[PDB]
Symmetry: D2
Subunit: 316 residues, 4 copies
Amino acid sequence: HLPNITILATGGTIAGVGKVGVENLVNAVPQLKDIANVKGEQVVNIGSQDMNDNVWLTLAKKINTDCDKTDGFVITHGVDTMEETAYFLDLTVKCDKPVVMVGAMRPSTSMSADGPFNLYNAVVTAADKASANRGVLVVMNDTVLDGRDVTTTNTTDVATFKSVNYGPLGYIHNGKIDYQRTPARKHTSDTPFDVSKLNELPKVGIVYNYANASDLPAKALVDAGYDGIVSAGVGNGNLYKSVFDTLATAAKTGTAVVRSSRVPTGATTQDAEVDDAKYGFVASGTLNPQKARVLLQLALTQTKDPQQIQQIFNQY
Amino acid sequence: HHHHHLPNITILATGGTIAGGGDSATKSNYTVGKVGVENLVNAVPQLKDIANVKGEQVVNIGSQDMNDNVWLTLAKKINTDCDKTDGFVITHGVDTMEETAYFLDLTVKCDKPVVMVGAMRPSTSMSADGPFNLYNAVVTAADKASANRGVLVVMNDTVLDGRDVTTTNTTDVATFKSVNYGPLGYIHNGKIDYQRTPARKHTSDTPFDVSKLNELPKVGIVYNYANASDLPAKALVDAGYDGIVSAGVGNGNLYKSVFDTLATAAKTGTAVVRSSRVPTGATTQDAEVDDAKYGFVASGTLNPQKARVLLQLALTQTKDPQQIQQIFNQY
Amino acid sequence: HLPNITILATGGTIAGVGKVGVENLVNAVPQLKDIANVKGEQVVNIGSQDMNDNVWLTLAKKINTDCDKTDGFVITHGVDTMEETAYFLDLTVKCDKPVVMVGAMRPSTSMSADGPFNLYNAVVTAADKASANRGVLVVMNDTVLDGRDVTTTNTTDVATFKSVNYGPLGYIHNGKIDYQRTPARKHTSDTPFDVSKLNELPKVGIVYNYANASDLPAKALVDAGYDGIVSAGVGNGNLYKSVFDTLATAAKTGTAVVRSSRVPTGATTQDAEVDDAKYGFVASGTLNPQKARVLLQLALTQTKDPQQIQQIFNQY
Amino acid sequence: HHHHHLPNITILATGGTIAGGGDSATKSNYTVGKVGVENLVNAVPQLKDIANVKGEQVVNIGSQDMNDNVWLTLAKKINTDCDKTDGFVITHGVDTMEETAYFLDLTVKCDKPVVMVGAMRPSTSMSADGPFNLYNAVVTAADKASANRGVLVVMNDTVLDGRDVTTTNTTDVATFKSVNYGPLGYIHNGKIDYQRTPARKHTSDTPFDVSKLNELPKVGIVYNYANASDLPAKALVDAGYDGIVSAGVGNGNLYKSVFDTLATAAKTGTAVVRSSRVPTGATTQDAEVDDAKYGFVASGTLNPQKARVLLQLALTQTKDPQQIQQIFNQY
Ligand SMILES: NC(=O)C[C@H](N)C(=O)O
Ligand SMILES: NC(=O)C[C@H](N)C(=O)O
Ligand SMILES: NC(=O)C[C@H](N)C(=O)O
Ligand SMILES: NC(=O)C[C@H](N)C(=O)O
Ligand SMILES: [Mg+2]
Ligand SMILES: [Mg+2]
């Protein structure tokens, strides 16, 4: 009569980076036995700054295969790219049981280390039946956050993770969650992305805009035949002239182009300064560049047509 | 008896959505840098209550196309014309305002106020924000208390320092905030209560002298993410870039491929600054990267585009990584 | 084939305060004709700092009676207590057609006045069929906010209104709304509060906590036989000792007592420092003191039992 | 040769959740001011690396029960013991920390650092925040650069000035922020980069001298909302209160009943300060209230509880509304 919860470990400073094994992490929080029967599996043990497509595909297939063997999943992970992995799993996971990602800003051995209570709260969330069907979740700093909107907002603050556009789903207090929101964007088993038989993802890179931006990064991606390029635009997804010329070319030359923004909140919109339809570009909406990459890679497993890509960007 | 005299304020116009226009008041489509400075001034009839305004159109572009030559033209003009006026307002686009503001913060030697201003809605839109913003920027440039605070950005009733200020939202009129150390002052009824001033050295306290420069050192920016390509970094290194700024993940970390390329580059004398794609907080020393070992510099609270500004200026004085680190600790 | 939209005007600086009539407000935004057929009715013309129970009851009955005559409602109102009126209507309105509140930080005649585009955007929201069944809404600064969580965060900023705990429902760009959230708390026709035949509300006052707080405010409410007292507590709804003693007494003497917090975000929780069950107190959750008053007044039309009041505070 | 010497730092303990305890590491129930200062110090073994720490238990309460007499005891103690130590940390509850911090900001004359610190989780909870907060507060009190910045609050790796600092969330360890003008500095690896200092007069630049005072003037706070009762205001007026602070709606506005009672009061010599229940921004002059006419004072960015602090101190010098307004413009 306690839930069966699986911890899939990937590394991160919660395990510091990526040094301590999943068994040690579990054993260091003996109160986990008050709330669940926890089984731990080591996927990788890396800093999430070196996170990659192979790990993503591994996690998605593992969760999908092992869904009916457990009541919920907790994924221990680095902070740096937690928001990218959360969103990838948000779109590719077909288990509608809770999938909860957790990290830590401080290691196990630092004063006032945040990882133990973080993990406790992540298991609370994975064990709550109300957590189901809300898509892939990130639990940090007593807060339950959806995988699409969650992002890291500060380089060192324990309270870094926030859903900056649409806000959190619930707060955790005394091992209980008052959920007041759920993501409306289609997730998990409401998406067509199916990664079960894929061993690589389409090649998508990210270029930065700023004053006097060089076009050389964008050119190097075009020259390598990248499947897609996300622009981290200025303001409402705008492009420096040199970058705009190279991306205009890419989009008529077999590279899907998504305009996102370096600006940390708000949508990159259509109908502003850029005629997306004319250039064949897709506007990313509230997806930031790293998140837009995620969805563009997945869109590219279904289609190369920019009109169909924009439609994906409007639904997921 | 004495007579009140209004300060002389010069508007240097560069374009931006503040000078943007579209064919409907109620649709979001517009084109930028289309309206001249005279039109802007005459849309704020009340400016005569507070200053004698003169405008000059320096260029008329979207700030998405801001570039080194416009930066050099502005700094030189302000430094040359200092004695001719009581203060400057610069009308500018939002997109790269935080870059131009910091460049000018480090290169203007005039110690009269320099205030930048823009708008999130075009001049043609319903409830356009540009008119009162411009009025507020003139208030600020005319205020004796505004002097010696460095170059300023005024937007949404708030006076922000050019170092910390950044745009936080793609569309919101409240977008501009000093996200680490906060604003200098708030404006109500044409009056400012200043409660802060930036401690970092600016303006006539920096060594950066652009008066004779006709170009700036080449500095590129590369982004980090999961499975990040090393191709952008390599392209910058193949082109002989003087510097590269890394938009790192978390506290300025790098994907291993990117790290490898930049370490190699730094050993051949490319300056490499670690910054962060994360929108607030410092990229610190003494975290996961041994900067001393690789010859890297940590950007502190400077975001990637701002670190590029200081790196380009740093490279005009020195190519030594320890001396560049000290610059990033002082300015 | 454009929606029929009714503007119910109450005053505020949008009409500055409370001086200009609803007809003038409408006529000043001739682009409203592009999106709706707008009919205006004047309810009152007051600064919302003088908002009161009679106006609330008027609005609720007017909307409920006139529901089937129109496609949506826009309510022009002052900023100062917009969050209280929004929440009252959120709980008492039985029309599930859009009800949208709007104000302005600057008058009609000030430079860059915010009221015209505010009103335009509020009519856009009231005319969108997707706006229906999300409860009573506040539209300010291109943002659609639920009436329960919305509050004013700054004394003068045009961007003051924010849903500080759970975030907005959607952003408005180019006359279109991308809704990604809806309130989970029960609203409008999912609440039992029925105000149709009520001409007054239970008497509920608010006392402030701080260092060395006087108990005299709380005593004056008890001495007048108030139906309820909301505490604006310190931190997690805590009470200064003198105030705590007087409120302990009130709760065993015929006055319902709700602990809220002066702190602008986060829940006033049970199971912290205060034994609510023992003192007969109710914890307000994320409802701030003025919002907790709203719900406590309505709870008092159904019940005086603190256990039943806490249950109301956990559902609405 | 020379030897490193560690600064002498005094911990004045007052209680708070930092000294709180509960029977489980994982339940939220706790009771406050239960654990003595010695226990706190010994839970941070690394404090010896940075200071010679001495603790004194001044009182042991929840800050929800903070009061004038504790404020007087603290200020007098700090001012008396200044020469005996290199800096002070005050362990304190969160709930009213922003009030005590501003009181001390206006009454300490010691110009060695005074740093307040607390915790959002009790000392017994999993991942308790108190230990590193205390470590960080000692870092800050030991840092020469911390002097002459006024009284400070250190929480969540951030150094905040006692005037602007407030608690923003009921439970979050990140709750403390300077919501109008931002923090002074951030702490990483035991080091602070200070980029701001408060312009408002504090400490030895104020006239407020509490050395001989054994009480403070009586100042109450009343809240405004729709249909607000005048009974609280009247109760304060019936008790002969020296001052009343209004927690107004929006920009410090009052419900008409409340307005009537306070106007009447002010005409009989009660000091009335308009503040706001809204969590950020100034209560300004020159808005909907004619303050001159009624003899009211506008609080600026001071929230109601902070305005009470300055009003009580103001009332020790003057009962004149124009002179009280000038105090609220300067401190
Ligand atoms: N706090 C952390 O987890 C940062 C670490 N670099 C990681 O992302 O793996
Ligand atoms: N709001 C704006 O000004 C955006 C415009 N693209 C600019 O930066 O010039
Ligand atoms: N901006 C405003 O609407 C404030 C005005 N006092 C009101 O609430 O009616
Ligand atoms: N977090 C805390 O310290 C709350 C406690 N009631 C106090 O203020 O003493
Ligand atoms: Mg004359
Ligand atoms: Mg010796």
